[PDB]
Amino acid sequence: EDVLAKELEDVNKWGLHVFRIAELSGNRPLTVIMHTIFQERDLLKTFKIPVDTLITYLMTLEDHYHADVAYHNNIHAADVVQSTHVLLSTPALEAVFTDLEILAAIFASAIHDVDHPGVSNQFLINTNSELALMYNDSSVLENHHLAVGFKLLQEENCDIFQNLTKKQRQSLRKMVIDIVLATDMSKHMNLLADLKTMVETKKVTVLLLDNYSDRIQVLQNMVHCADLSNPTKPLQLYRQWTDRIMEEFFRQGDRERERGMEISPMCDKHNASVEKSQVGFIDYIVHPLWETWADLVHPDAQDILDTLEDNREWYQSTIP
Amino acid sequence: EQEDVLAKELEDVNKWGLHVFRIAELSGNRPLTVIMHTIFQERDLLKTFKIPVDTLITYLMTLEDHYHADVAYHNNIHAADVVQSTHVLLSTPALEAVFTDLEILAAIFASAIHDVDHPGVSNQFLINTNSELALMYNDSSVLENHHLAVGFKLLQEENCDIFQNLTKKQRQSLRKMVIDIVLATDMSKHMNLLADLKTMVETKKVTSSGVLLLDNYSDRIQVLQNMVHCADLSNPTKPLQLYRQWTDRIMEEFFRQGDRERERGMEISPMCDKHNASVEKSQVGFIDYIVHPLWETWADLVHPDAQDILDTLEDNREWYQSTIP
Ligand SMILES: CCOc1cc2c(cc1OC)CN(C=O)CC2
Ligand SMILES: CCOc1cc2c(cc1OC)CN(C=O)CC2
Ligand SMILES: [Mg+2]
Ligand SMILES: [Mg+2]
Ligand SMILES: [Mg+2]
Ligand SMILES: [Zn+2]
Ligand SMILES: [Zn+2]
């Protein structure tokens, strides 16, 4: 347990040993990392959150991530939380966001994939699932993650927001919904176009963002960057994330094949190129997003962008 | 004899001003079932889509049951009225041969389901009271998402799949169109929907035949969304004896919501305080700021097809205004 404490000293660093933390904590990385971050940011004292209520909520939330899903599980949630925590400290975003906006971004990251079944929105729609029927085919998973994350606050001794005012709770809820809905990959291109527009109109002394529309767009892109941060991490971490997403994708492909469905891109284990897929995803999605983020916060994201470019070069070199 | 009178009244299904409340009584509180059945026969939809008649009746009766008989306005009579009003608007000369049979089916089905399982309180009430519905739907078009989910889920009940003989591509296209239409009935979308309809009117293209030219999905679905929204907001355009009954019903529903807000220590929603209400000023305001701007624009889109409807709306506005001084 002293090993676990030593690993958590890196909580402010990109490249935290999140898999080691998952093992050392008895598969409770979300709980221990969220607790650590709330302490580092003084969020329990600021929002009068009882520590026992926080721990109880976090353990319940963590229990609703599926242990048999290779990628979209509590380790991914913990990684997105910790990554958002680092991005919130970008010098170019210094004191841009209120304590309530910080709480919203962190809470949104923690719940943003809760109860994920390990299959995509398109799979849920095409199989006429109960989830797609409930949500009218529109951000099916993301609406469900939000609903579960909020519903769990109603469990016994789980209301971590009990001492927020009515106004603060309504504002936080709206921001969390706006952030988690923006994690739907079908919204990526629109989010990126809006981030590009903001970079072009960037006002700086350090970023100056006067209206809520611009600030929520930054928080949306921030959590989206954290969600898409695997290729920007040290290679030993990134390769583990690649193994996990490919296992989850191949299992979806096995279900599609057993049902006689058309197999989704990257999901056909008999016809996959793991490495070409990573290079393509960096080239078309991850690098355009992170290059734009780096422009917004220049030069604070340079080391992250450097790692992403090194990792892209390495994956390309594994292709004969 | 009661069935004879019902059949006579259903002969008016192509007319604005159908005696929908009489039909509700004569049909044994099955206005949505009998009006939908009549419209499907009138448009030959059972034959076109190979819909078994017993499946249609079974679905319609189950759908109608899922409207709340104890809600004064948002009940099966309102659904039947919106269905029949959409059916009349679809027949307007400016739209002849514009929409496919599948698009017609989508608009009519959307109208039938568009308020199903409505609890008689607003989205804002459901959000402010931390309701299970608002928790499920993340405060976003709460009611309208629920109406769609119920209307589609009921197709899965025994002998209820009225779309069983559509192709897969037809079912997929119909589902998307119905979702787009019902979500556009959320009043929080009204201003943007109207702004877009005005832009279409200002740029509208007509064919050699004189009908509206709609050559992409975005324009086609926008017309159908505004058509069903106009039907949903059509009460002040109806003959006055129908309009006044609708006003009595919405006020009962509003006042019951306001009583719940007052008991909870909440600010009472506009028009919901029975101790500080002006029913007549509220109707004039409704017309001037919502219903007439919308219907004047729809009338411009289909000009001059909707002139008599617009004239009735203006006469009814004058009537309510005259009761104020
Ligand atoms: C190393 C991780 O690689 C990936 C992660 C994810 C995707 C694609 C990836 O690579 C092709 C697509 N997603 C959902 O569909 C989000 C997660
Ligand atoms: C004669 C009917 O009058 C009305 C009907 C409705 C509203 C307002 C009305 O008048 C002020 C507002 N709505 C929902 O909140 C839709 C239904
Ligand atoms: Mg997700
Ligand atoms: Mg009922
Ligand atoms: Mg409605
Ligand atoms: Zn995620
Ligand atoms: Zn309605």
Side-chain angles (χ1 to χ4, degrees), chain A residues 252-254 256-257 261 263-269:
Chain A
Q252 169 175 331
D254 291 349
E256 293 168 325
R257 89 171 69 265
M261 307 176 52
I263 301 172
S264 294
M266 308 173 282
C267 293
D268 185 0
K269 67 190 177 185

Side-chain angles (χ1 to χ4, degrees), chain B residues 186-197:
Chain B
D186 179 349
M187 274 299 298
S188 74
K189 309 202 173 111
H190 165 83
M191 288 301 172
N192 286 338
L193 205 65
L194 181 51
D196 281 351
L197 181 68

Side-chain angles (χ1 to χ4, degrees), chain B residues 130-141:
Chain B
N130 314 118
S131 66
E132 282 304 297
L133 278 175
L135 183 67
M136 182 71 73
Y137 289 113
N138 300 305
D139 298 342
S140 305
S141 301

